[model samples]
Target chain A: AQDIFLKIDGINGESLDDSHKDEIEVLNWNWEIQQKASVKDLTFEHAIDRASPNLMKYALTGKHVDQAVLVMRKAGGNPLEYLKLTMSDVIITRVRPSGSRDDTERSRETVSLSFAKVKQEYVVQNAQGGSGGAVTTSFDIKGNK
Target chain B: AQDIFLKIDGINGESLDDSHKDEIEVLNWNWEIQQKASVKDLTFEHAIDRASPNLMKYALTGKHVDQAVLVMRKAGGNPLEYLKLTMSDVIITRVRPSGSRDDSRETVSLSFAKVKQEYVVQNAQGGSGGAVTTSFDIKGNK
Candidate 1:
């Protein structure tokens, strides 16, 4: 089973009053998943440090790249009784592996990569014990680009 | 004198394989200053809540707002070490009135009114501790 997931990495600044001091948190990104939407004839996967073999196959062969959406989660906390969040500067990079994963050595081949900025919006709400939001966008990422 | 400060809110997540799952901390947030920058003009007055009248005068009036940059200190720990955190969304409505320091109502507000992302980054071999990198950017926040 090839793990398919997405990673979100970025920075943010917040102020609740009129102060010059800012609170900064540098983002360390890592995520992956394993799943196959057999019902709809689809598969999705992701790798953090390196691209997974299964994801490499789909990206290179030009198949199984659709049916997935990746979004980054920013500063989270208890809701203000009710809530919403606005996101921007969303970028997507197509992961391509250079060689086969026959041996651990072959997998070391560096890949040529490209990235495109996908600007969109998400309105997250509280779900269960955590928070969830509704995403709003008129752009097609994997479909158009 | 009124005191002002910043709060670093954190959220925790974990990954066994490649899948990351979000989790909450039982305890809420703890406020602390990790690096204290040296300032030339202002003296160490006091720490105030983000919405205190004295602090709000700096924020809304934009007069004292220039002095909002608070100091942080490095507690002799490797700044590169990973940190786990959780944050809570809060609003500052009423605060201790200016010139009236009631022990029960005296609470300092966060330095800034807008929510911004902040970071502290250190090069591999530079100094003993890390330096505050850049101011946090709140997405779609104007």
Candidate 2:
């Protein structure tokens, strides 16, 4: 079981230049994580948007940071710890086309952005803080950078 | 579209003993290559055996080998210029179960066996004279 925590650098292709003091615009990042069994079969998860339109603004912005980060946290002590894995830097791979369909059968294609980056961070449990726990690794990421 | 070839190196597993050649055997090698619009959504050609049972015998005997090897060949062109990429010596990342079926399902895995290897002779194209054109650049610089 692999747990991935996605930390948004910013929204609308903006940078987190402001120390997160200003109104942290939590964009409705709707995307699914698809896993393939071998290179043959695949399984898809529904778009996961932690900051949905329904969540309270303050809660969504302030309290939700932990909640959003917690999305990848498992119930038991971090399973990732056993494997000794952690994520540090995010790399932007590619930006591509994306679109949605209308009520009618007609379709539209929008030039959307997609990204793939390798996470770079490795820590030995005994070295960092307390029991250290996990080492860092990276993957080909495709989403908002 | 990118064409990725597969191969076997017998590395990192049980070390081959002096009688290793006799012990090694081919159960079955089946795979498919597909295309997709998004990396998340993709399709593959129905799995193809590529190599027949007779070929497997030669492979097991260490006479001729067939793992997965990617070679870029030009269609209807001179056969002199071709490039081949072999993932046989590649470092495997991870391997897990794959497919919809619970039991016979294949496992999904990852490997660092990315690129950079010499081209070997492919018999399927026509034996030693058989040529598969490939780019000289393994890193895809060109």
Candidate 3:
């Protein structure tokens, strides 16, 4: 079974409330590099960049953003974590409401953010309980700098 | 694969918010009957009572109770459904803070009584797509 969790930081780097947990949607990171080459030759001389700044993207539904924004304004910039089995840092760069037209369903808005860096840690459970029974493998990736 | 979903009503008979969904926990229904017997005759009568009103118990974390209680109070009573599992008629009977010590965790409990005595014992699926068929067996003991 796949389970997802997140830890968000408030303006002062404190843990934010987790009331709107169901609204959070964890997205995958799509990273690609541009290779440069001449039309006459097939071999590439150099690569433009190793990665992109948009490391991750996530969406929040309902009134979570309104409450989160207030905390961010009081504390400073908010930091987030994407727990896809393992936990990783998700630096929030921007927030915007998902575009929508006149509709009758409900007045709901989604808040989307682009992260600067991301990480993932793989954990293996050897036994049900006790110390030293679990083994963990981990790695981190930062967007284009 | 089986998926479970729940729909609950507010105190005013409105749809309950899903904001505190992680806090919701469904529980099993407890059903039992009291039997009456004679010592000398070594025979027993039918039964004293069918089942108690305390049919099910649910626990919620955090402040979900604040919202749920408001709905229950408004609607006088709330109704619940457990989809996929097919459990229905879960009438909200009581809502109270679970007793706990000052140093431990905070928990709220909700008590429910099943309006219908029937219970689904098993569900079987066969075939695929349009030809697919599903069967459910229910038993009623009242």
Candidate 4:
């Protein structure tokens, strides 16, 4: 059995296990879309293109996006996360909160979020042999293009 | 007709109007009671000392304090508000979520720390001969 976990900025705020039942609704995602195409114009027309390997866009709707949003806003708006379903380096693009009315009908407070995955690069420097020097590492992620 | 409102940062997580009931249970408050006193041992014993002013400690036990605690934590933990009850600057000190076996007994307890009175002033000036000037001063009660 696989558990669902949402880790953002090193904080595990939401978890879906046997005891907790906070469902995550994932909408359609655009990952294999073509970005650039080449067309040949002659007596007969021909077209050939390759799908660009870029950040994938997804829409994730849930009730507890507020918890993630709180931590993201505190970290100055751009926070990285690890989503079990996506299994990619994701960043929140937008957050929308939906409020319900208190009438005969009942509804839940919901929040919709937009996420995109990007590639990250890491650099590591090892110490010199037998000198016991210090080691340093740095990392950077690709932003939206 | 007066309305009671609680504003922490930008979130107004709680409010009460005519439809709400007013029931507040105040616990204990230690407000400047002389813990100990001393008189000099002279030929004729005489003592003259004024009571020292200290931080007023209060314990406010209520349910709404929980709501404020949630909002404050959501707003990055530091929240400032004005309440007639405390009559000074207040911030949440602790939040204890209490759970019972029965579903009806679920509750959250909260503690708040009141700040002492302080004065702040701001001054602004312009460059011209007839310069524009603005000044702001804030002073609070004990």
lDDT of 4 by residue, B1-142 (tens): 1223322221121122232222211112122212222211101100100000000001111112222211011112322221222212232222111111112011111223332222222223211123233222212211
Fraction of native Cα-Cα interface contacts (under 8 Å, chains A and B) also present in model 4: 0.00
Please report, in order, the local distance difference test score of every candidate based on alpha carbons: 0.26, 0.26, 0.21, 0.20
Residue range B5-68, candidate 2, lDDT tens digits: 2234321111123322212122222333335211111111111121112221222222322233
- Candidate 3 vs candidate 4: the TM-score winner is 3
Docking class of 1: incorrect
Model 2 clashes, total count: 27
Model 1 residue A119 CA deviation in Å: 8.8
Error of 4 at B65 (Å): 14
Instruction: Tell me how far the alpha carbon of residue A142 in candidate 1 is from the true structure, in angstroms, after superposition.
Output: 9.1
Q: Sort all candidates by lDDT, best to worst.
A: 1, 2, 3, 4
Stretches of candidate 1 off by over 4 Å are: A1-51, A73-121, A124-135, A140-145, B1-142
True contacts kept of each: 0.00, 0.00, 0.00, 0.00
- Predicted candidate 1 versus true structure: per-residue lDDT over B25-92, tens digit per residue: 11112344333232112222222112222232222222323212232323344333223221223222
Residue A101's lDDT within candidate 2 is 69
Model 1 chain A worst lDDT run, 10 consecutive residues: A32-41
Collision count for each candidate, in order: 61, 27, 9, 0
Q: Each prediction's DockQ? A: 0.01, 0.03, 0.01, 0.01
Best by DockQ: 2
TM-score of chain B of 4: 0.23
- Regions of candidate 3 where Cα sits further than 4 Å from its true position: A1-3, A11-90, A98-117, A122-145, B1-142
Task: Report the alpha-carbon TM-score of model 3 versus the true structure.
Answer: 0.20
